[PDB]
Amino acid sequence: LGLLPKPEPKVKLSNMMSVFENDQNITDPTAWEKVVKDQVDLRKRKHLEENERRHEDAIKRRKEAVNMNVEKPTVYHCKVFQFKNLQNPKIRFKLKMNSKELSLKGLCLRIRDDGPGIIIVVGNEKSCKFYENLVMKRIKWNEDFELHTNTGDIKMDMHNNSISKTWEGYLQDCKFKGWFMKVCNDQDSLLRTLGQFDSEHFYSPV
RNA sequence: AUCCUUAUGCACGGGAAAUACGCAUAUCAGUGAGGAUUCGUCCGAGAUUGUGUUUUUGCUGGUUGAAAUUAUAAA
RNA sequence: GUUCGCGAACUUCGUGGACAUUUGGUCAAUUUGAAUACAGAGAUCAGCAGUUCCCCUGCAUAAGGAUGAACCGUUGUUUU
Protein backbone atom coordinates (compact mmCIF):
# COMPACT_ATOMS: atom_id res chain seq x y z
CA LEU A 1 0.00 0.00 0.00
CA GLY A 2 3.13 2.17 -0.42
CA LEU A 3 5.82 1.37 -2.97
CA LEU A 4 8.07 3.74 -0.98
CA PRO A 5 11.16 1.51 -1.62
CA LYS A 6 11.57 -1.62 -3.82
CA PRO A 7 12.66 -5.21 -2.91
CA GLU A 8 15.42 -6.68 -5.13
CA PRO A 9 16.82 -10.23 -5.35
CA LYS A 10 19.56 -11.00 -2.84
CA VAL A 11 22.20 -12.63 -5.05
CA LYS A 12 25.38 -14.30 -3.82
CA LEU A 13 28.09 -16.36 -5.55
CA SER A 14 25.90 -19.50 -5.18
CA ASN A 15 22.80 -17.78 -6.54
CA MET A 16 24.78 -15.83 -9.17
CA MET A 17 24.22 -18.52 -11.82
CA SER A 18 20.49 -18.73 -11.08
CA VAL A 19 19.28 -15.08 -10.87
CA PHE A 20 17.85 -13.51 -14.05
CA GLU A 21 15.83 -10.51 -12.71
CA ASN A 22 18.88 -8.31 -13.18
CA ASP A 23 20.22 -8.50 -16.73
CA GLN A 24 23.64 -9.48 -18.16
CA ASN A 25 23.82 -12.71 -16.16
CA ILE A 26 25.46 -14.70 -19.04
CA THR A 27 25.72 -11.95 -21.62
CA ASP A 28 28.57 -10.15 -19.75
CA PRO A 29 29.84 -12.82 -17.38
CA THR A 30 32.59 -10.90 -15.61
CA ALA A 31 30.45 -7.76 -15.37
CA TRP A 32 27.75 -9.89 -13.77
CA GLU A 33 30.29 -11.39 -11.39
CA LYS A 34 31.49 -7.91 -10.44
CA VAL A 35 27.91 -6.81 -9.79
CA VAL A 36 27.15 -9.81 -7.62
CA LYS A 37 30.46 -9.81 -5.76
CA ASP A 38 30.12 -6.04 -5.43
CA GLN A 39 26.62 -6.44 -4.02
CA VAL A 40 27.89 -9.01 -1.52
CA ASP A 41 30.69 -6.66 -0.46
CA LEU A 42 28.20 -3.83 0.01
CA ARG A 43 26.01 -6.08 2.16
CA LYS A 44 29.03 -7.05 4.26
CA ARG A 45 30.35 -3.49 4.20
CA LYS A 46 26.92 -2.20 5.23
CA HIS A 47 26.88 -4.61 8.16
CA LEU A 48 30.38 -3.53 9.17
CA GLU A 49 29.45 0.12 8.64
CA GLU A 50 26.41 -0.34 10.87
CA ASN A 51 28.59 -1.93 13.55
CA GLU A 52 31.04 0.96 13.32
CA ARG A 53 28.20 3.45 13.68
CA ARG A 54 26.92 1.60 16.74
CA HIS A 55 30.40 1.65 18.26
CA GLU A 56 30.67 5.38 17.64
CA ASP A 57 27.27 6.25 19.08
CA ALA A 58 27.83 4.09 22.16
CA ILE A 59 31.15 5.85 22.74
CA LYS A 60 29.46 9.23 22.38
CA ARG A 61 26.79 8.21 24.88
CA ARG A 62 29.23 6.82 27.42
CA LYS A 63 31.24 9.99 27.98
CA GLU A 64 28.09 12.07 28.38
CA ALA A 65 26.49 9.38 30.53
CA VAL A 66 29.35 9.20 33.03
CA ASN A 67 29.26 12.98 33.45
CA MET A 68 25.49 12.87 33.96
CA ASN A 69 25.69 10.17 36.65
CA VAL A 70 26.48 12.08 39.86
CA GLU A 71 24.17 9.77 41.85
CA LYS A 72 23.99 10.06 45.65
CA PRO A 73 25.92 7.09 47.12
CA THR A 74 23.92 5.42 49.91
CA VAL A 75 26.62 3.16 51.46
CA TYR A 76 30.35 2.72 50.81
CA HIS A 77 32.34 -0.49 51.10
CA CYS A 78 35.86 0.09 52.39
CA LYS A 79 39.04 -1.97 52.63
CA VAL A 80 42.18 -0.88 54.52
CA PHE A 81 45.41 -2.80 53.94
CA GLN A 82 48.94 -2.53 55.18
CA PHE A 83 52.29 -3.37 53.64
CA LYS A 84 55.81 -3.58 55.08
CA ASN A 85 57.38 -1.80 52.08
CA LEU A 86 56.77 -0.47 48.56
CA GLN A 87 60.10 0.86 47.20
CA ASN A 88 58.88 -0.53 43.85
CA PRO A 89 57.49 2.05 41.40
CA LYS A 90 55.26 -0.53 39.73
CA ILE A 91 53.11 -1.23 42.78
CA ARG A 92 52.66 2.50 43.38
CA PHE A 93 51.67 3.01 39.75
CA LYS A 94 49.12 0.20 40.00
CA LEU A 95 47.68 1.74 43.16
CA LYS A 96 47.35 5.09 41.40
CA MET A 97 45.94 4.16 38.00
CA ASN A 98 43.54 1.53 39.32
CA SER A 99 42.21 3.99 41.90
CA LYS A 100 41.73 6.62 39.21
CA GLU A 101 39.84 4.12 37.06
CA LEU A 102 37.50 2.93 39.83
CA SER A 103 36.29 6.25 41.35
CA LEU A 104 37.95 4.80 44.41
CA LYS A 105 37.79 7.22 47.30
CA GLY A 106 40.67 6.63 49.70
CA LEU A 107 44.47 6.89 49.94
CA CYS A 108 47.75 5.11 50.50
CA LEU A 109 49.82 6.50 53.40
CA ARG A 110 53.24 5.33 54.52
CA ILE A 111 56.27 6.10 56.66
CA ARG A 112 59.83 6.94 55.46
CA ASP A 113 59.37 5.69 51.84
CA ASP A 114 60.94 2.24 52.47
CA GLY A 115 58.94 1.85 55.72
CA PRO A 116 55.58 0.18 56.38
CA GLY A 117 52.34 1.79 55.27
CA ILE A 118 48.58 1.65 54.97
CA ILE A 119 46.06 1.74 52.11
CA ILE A 120 42.46 2.84 52.69
CA VAL A 121 40.20 2.17 49.70
CA VAL A 122 36.51 3.06 49.60
CA GLY A 123 33.63 2.97 47.12
CA ASN A 124 31.18 0.63 45.44
CA GLU A 125 31.59 -2.97 46.48
CA LYS A 126 32.65 -4.47 43.16
CA SER A 127 35.36 -1.84 42.72
CA CYS A 128 36.63 -2.50 46.24
CA LYS A 129 36.75 -6.23 45.55
CA PHE A 130 38.72 -5.60 42.36
CA TYR A 131 41.16 -3.41 44.26
CA GLU A 132 41.61 -6.11 46.89
CA ASN A 133 42.28 -8.68 44.18
CA LEU A 134 44.87 -6.40 42.61
CA VAL A 135 46.55 -5.92 45.98
CA MET A 136 46.65 -9.59 46.93
CA LYS A 137 46.57 -11.82 43.83
CA ARG A 138 47.88 -9.70 40.93
CA ILE A 139 50.71 -7.88 42.67
CA LYS A 140 53.64 -9.72 44.22
CA TRP A 141 54.92 -7.48 47.04
CA ASN A 142 57.61 -10.18 47.51
CA GLU A 143 59.16 -9.47 44.08
CA ASP A 144 62.70 -8.20 43.36
CA PHE A 145 62.76 -4.93 41.40
CA GLU A 146 64.94 -2.13 40.01
CA LEU A 147 65.05 1.57 41.01
CA HIS A 148 66.02 3.94 38.17
CA THR A 149 68.05 6.98 39.33
CA ASN A 150 70.88 9.25 38.09
CA THR A 151 73.59 7.71 40.33
CA GLY A 152 72.87 4.11 39.30
CA ASP A 153 70.04 1.62 38.79
CA ILE A 154 69.57 0.03 42.24
CA LYS A 155 68.48 -3.61 42.67
CA MET A 156 66.03 -4.01 45.58
CA ASP A 157 65.75 -7.58 46.88
CA MET A 158 62.65 -7.67 49.12
CA HIS A 159 61.77 -11.22 50.15
CA ASN A 160 60.97 -9.75 53.61
CA ASN A 161 58.15 -7.47 52.35
CA SER A 162 54.53 -8.68 52.64
CA ILE A 163 50.93 -7.38 52.48
CA SER A 164 47.85 -7.88 54.68
CA LYS A 165 44.21 -6.82 54.46
CA THR A 166 43.28 -5.25 57.78
CA TRP A 167 39.68 -4.14 57.30
CA GLU A 168 36.90 -4.96 54.88
CA GLY A 169 33.91 -2.97 56.16
CA TYR A 170 31.12 -0.46 55.54
CA LEU A 171 31.75 3.16 56.47
CA GLN A 172 28.84 5.38 57.53
CA ASP A 173 30.15 8.20 55.34
CA CYS A 174 33.15 8.31 53.01
CA LYS A 175 35.05 11.44 54.06
CA PHE A 176 37.80 10.81 51.49
CA LYS A 177 37.36 13.41 48.73
CA GLY A 178 39.64 11.45 46.34
CA TRP A 179 42.66 9.10 46.40
CA PHE A 180 45.39 10.97 48.19
CA MET A 181 48.53 8.74 48.22
CA LYS A 182 51.24 10.13 50.54
CA VAL A 183 54.47 9.63 52.45
CA CYS A 184 55.30 10.87 55.96
CA ASN A 185 58.60 11.34 57.82
CA ASP A 186 57.07 10.07 61.10
CA GLN A 187 54.21 8.13 62.72
CA ASP A 188 52.61 11.10 64.47
CA SER A 189 52.46 12.94 61.15
CA LEU A 190 50.81 9.93 59.52
CA LEU A 191 48.26 9.76 62.33
CA ARG A 192 47.50 13.46 61.91
CA THR A 193 47.02 12.98 58.18
CA LEU A 194 44.65 10.08 58.82
CA GLY A 195 42.67 12.22 61.26
CA GLN A 196 42.24 14.90 58.53
CA PHE A 197 39.23 12.71 57.58
CA ASP A 198 38.22 12.55 61.30
CA SER A 199 39.31 8.88 61.31
CA GLU A 200 42.66 7.73 62.73
CA HIS A 201 41.64 4.17 63.52
CA PHE A 202 42.29 2.66 60.08
CA TYR A 203 46.00 2.34 61.02
CA SER A 204 47.11 -0.62 63.11
CA PRO A 205 50.48 -0.57 64.89
CA VAL A 206 52.01 -4.09 65.20
C1' A B 1 42.46 0.58 28.30
C1' U B 2 43.25 -5.09 26.54
C1' C B 3 41.01 -10.45 26.74
C1' C B 4 37.17 -13.71 27.92
C1' U B 5 31.90 -15.85 30.05
C1' U B 6 26.88 -15.80 30.03
C1' A B 7 22.11 -13.82 28.29
C1' U B 8 19.88 -11.03 25.18
C1' G B 9 19.01 -7.49 21.09
C1' C B 10 20.66 -6.15 15.85
C1' A B 11 22.78 -7.92 11.90
C1' C B 12 26.76 -10.27 8.07
C1' G B 13 27.63 -15.18 6.81
C1' G B 14 26.60 -20.80 6.65
C1' G B 15 23.21 -24.48 7.30
C1' A B 16 18.53 -27.70 8.50
C1' A B 17 13.00 -27.61 8.94
C1' A B 18 8.27 -26.19 7.65
C1' U B 19 4.44 -33.09 9.76
C1' A B 20 5.85 -27.49 11.40
C1' C B 21 4.78 -23.11 13.34
C1' G B 22 1.47 -20.09 15.95
C1' C B 23 -2.87 -17.89 18.53
C1' A B 24 -6.31 -18.24 22.85
C1' U B 25 -11.28 -13.42 27.98
C1' A B 26 -9.90 -21.18 28.11
C1' U B 27 -8.52 -25.43 32.32
C1' C B 28 -4.21 -26.63 35.14
C1' A B 29 0.75 -26.07 36.23
C1' G B 30 8.50 -25.18 40.26
C1' U B 31 2.53 -24.43 46.74
C1' G B 32 5.19 -29.66 40.76
C1' A B 33 3.74 -29.98 34.43
C1' G B 34 5.46 -34.17 32.08
C1' G B 35 8.71 -37.84 32.51
C1' A B 36 12.86 -41.26 33.79
C1' U B 37 14.41 -46.19 37.77
C1' U B 38 19.48 -50.41 38.30
C1' C B 39 13.39 -49.39 42.72
C1' G B 40 17.43 -47.03 46.54
C1' U B 41 16.00 -43.14 43.46
C1' C B 42 16.59 -39.54 39.36
C1' C B 43 15.44 -35.58 35.88
C1' G B 44 12.62 -31.06 36.37
C1' A B 45 8.98 -27.70 32.58
C1' G B 46 5.15 -27.71 30.15
C1' A B 47 0.55 -30.23 29.92
C1' U B 48 -4.64 -30.32 28.78
C1' U B 49 -8.46 -28.20 25.76
C1' G B 50 -9.96 -25.28 21.62
C1' U B 51 -8.37 -23.75 17.37
C1' G B 52 -5.61 -21.00 12.43
C1' U B 53 -2.80 -22.04 8.57
C1' U B 54 0.09 -26.23 7.50
C1' U B 55 2.06 -30.79 -0.52
C1' U B 56 3.09 -23.99 2.24
C1' U B 57 2.81 -16.53 3.33
C1' G B 58 4.73 -12.25 0.58
C1' C B 59 6.97 -10.64 -3.53
C1' U B 60 9.83 -10.62 -8.46
C1' G B 61 11.56 -12.55 -13.44
C1' G B 62 11.32 -15.24 -17.97
C1' U B 63 9.37 -18.09 -21.87
C1' U B 64 5.36 -18.45 -23.79
C1' G B 65 0.87 -18.91 -25.34
C1' A B 66 -3.63 -15.76 -25.13
C1' A B 67 -3.72 -14.31 -31.06
C1' A B 68 -0.02 -11.29 -28.83
C1' U B 69 -2.18 -5.32 -32.43
C1' U B 70 1.25 0.12 -34.90
C1' A B 71 0.18 7.61 -34.16
C1' U B 72 -1.51 12.63 -38.30
C1' A B 73 -1.58 14.55 -42.63
C1' A B 74 -0.69 18.62 -46.75
C1' A B 75 0.13 18.59 -51.70
C1' G C 1 -43.71 -70.15 -37.66
C1' U C 2 -37.68 -68.67 -37.71
C1' U C 3 -32.59 -70.28 -38.26
C1' C C 4 -28.36 -74.25 -37.89
C1' G C 5 -27.25 -79.89 -38.46
C1' C C 6 -28.07 -84.91 -40.20
C1' G C 7 -31.13 -89.04 -43.63
C1' A C 8 -34.23 -89.73 -48.85
C1' A C 9 -36.01 -88.08 -53.84
C1' C C 10 -31.92 -75.27 -54.82
C1' U C 11 -36.98 -77.58 -53.72
C1' U C 12 -39.69 -80.94 -50.64
C1' C C 13 -40.54 -84.93 -46.63
C1' G C 14 -38.06 -87.71 -41.81
C1' U C 15 -35.84 -85.27 -37.57
C1' G C 16 -31.88 -83.22 -33.09
C1' G C 17 -31.01 -78.32 -30.65
C1' A C 18 -31.82 -72.98 -30.15
C1' C C 19 -35.90 -68.85 -30.30
C1' A C 20 -38.54 -63.14 -24.08
C1' U C 21 -38.22 -58.14 -23.21
C1' U C 22 -37.30 -53.42 -21.93
C1' U C 23 -34.98 -49.49 -17.21
C1' G C 24 -30.53 -48.18 -16.16
C1' G C 25 -27.97 -43.92 -23.32
C1' U C 26 -31.24 -36.05 -21.87
C1' C C 27 -24.50 -32.08 -23.08
C1' A C 28 -24.57 -27.66 -20.26
C1' A C 29 -24.53 -22.28 -21.52
C1' U C 30 -27.03 -18.29 -24.32
C1' U C 31 -31.17 -16.15 -27.57
C1' U C 32 -36.72 -18.39 -27.17
C1' G C 33 -42.10 -17.23 -27.38
C1' A C 34 -36.87 -24.06 -31.81
C1' A C 35 -32.12 -21.62 -33.21
C1' U C 36 -27.11 -20.66 -31.81
C1' A C 37 -23.68 -22.63 -29.70
C1' C C 38 -20.63 -27.79 -29.28
C1' A C 39 -18.13 -29.55 -23.71
C1' G C 40 -17.07 -24.53 -21.35
C1' A C 41 -12.26 -21.18 -20.91
C1' G C 42 -4.22 -19.21 -17.87
C1' A C 43 0.07 -22.66 -18.61
C1' U C 44 4.74 -24.18 -17.82
C1' C C 45 10.14 -22.82 -16.08
C1' A C 46 12.74 -20.09 -12.33
C1' G C 47 14.70 -16.45 -8.33
C1' C C 48 14.17 -13.96 -3.69
C1' A C 49 12.64 -12.84 0.72
C1' G C 50 9.76 -14.22 4.72
C1' U C 51 8.66 -18.13 9.35
C1' U C 52 11.24 -21.55 12.95
C1' C C 53 15.71 -23.86 14.86
C1' C C 54 20.71 -24.18 14.83
C1' C C 55 26.02 -22.87 14.12
C1' C C 56 29.61 -19.36 13.29
C1' U C 57 31.17 -13.96 12.93
C1' G C 58 31.08 -8.39 14.47
C1' C C 59 28.63 -4.75 17.20
C1' A C 60 25.43 -3.16 21.23
C1' U C 61 23.53 -3.48 26.08
C1' A C 62 23.33 -5.74 30.80
C1' A C 63 25.64 -8.10 34.26
C1' G C 64 30.29 -10.87 35.73
C1' G C 65 35.16 -11.89 35.57
C1' A C 66 40.69 -11.96 34.22
C1' U C 67 44.94 -8.75 32.95
C1' G C 68 48.09 -4.88 31.56
C1' A C 69 50.56 -0.32 31.69
C1' A C 70 56.95 4.79 34.86
C1' C C 71 56.12 7.69 39.43
C1' C C 72 55.78 10.85 43.00
C1' G C 73 50.57 13.17 43.60
C1' U C 74 46.54 16.59 46.87
C1' U C 75 44.12 18.89 51.60
C1' G C 76 75.14 46.21 51.61
C1' U C 77 74.90 43.41 45.08
C1' U C 78 73.62 36.64 41.44
C1' U C 79 67.88 31.81 42.97
C1' U C 80 62.25 35.96 44.68
Swiss-Prot record:
State where the protein is found: Nucleus
Lineage: superkingdom? Eukaryota
- Note, other: Present with 432 molecules/cell in log phase SD medium.
The subunit field of the Swiss-Prot or TrEMBL record says:
Component of the U4/U6-U5 tri-snRNP complex composed of the U4, U6 and U5 snRNAs and at least PRP3, PRP4, PRP6, PRP8, PRP18, PRP31, PRP38, SNU13, SNU23, SNU66, SNU114, SPP381, SMB1, SMD1, SMD2, SMD3, SMX2, SMX3, LSM2, LSM3, LSM4, LSM5, LSM6, LSM7, LSM8, BRR2 and DIB1.
This chain's function reads: Participates in pre-mRNA splicing. Part of the U4/U5/U6 tri-snRNP complex, one of the building blocks of the spliceosome.
- What name has this protein been given in UniProt? U4/U6 small nuclear ribonucleoprotein PRP3
Question: Source organism lineage?
Answer: Eukaryota, Fungi, Dikarya, Ascomycota, Saccharomycotina
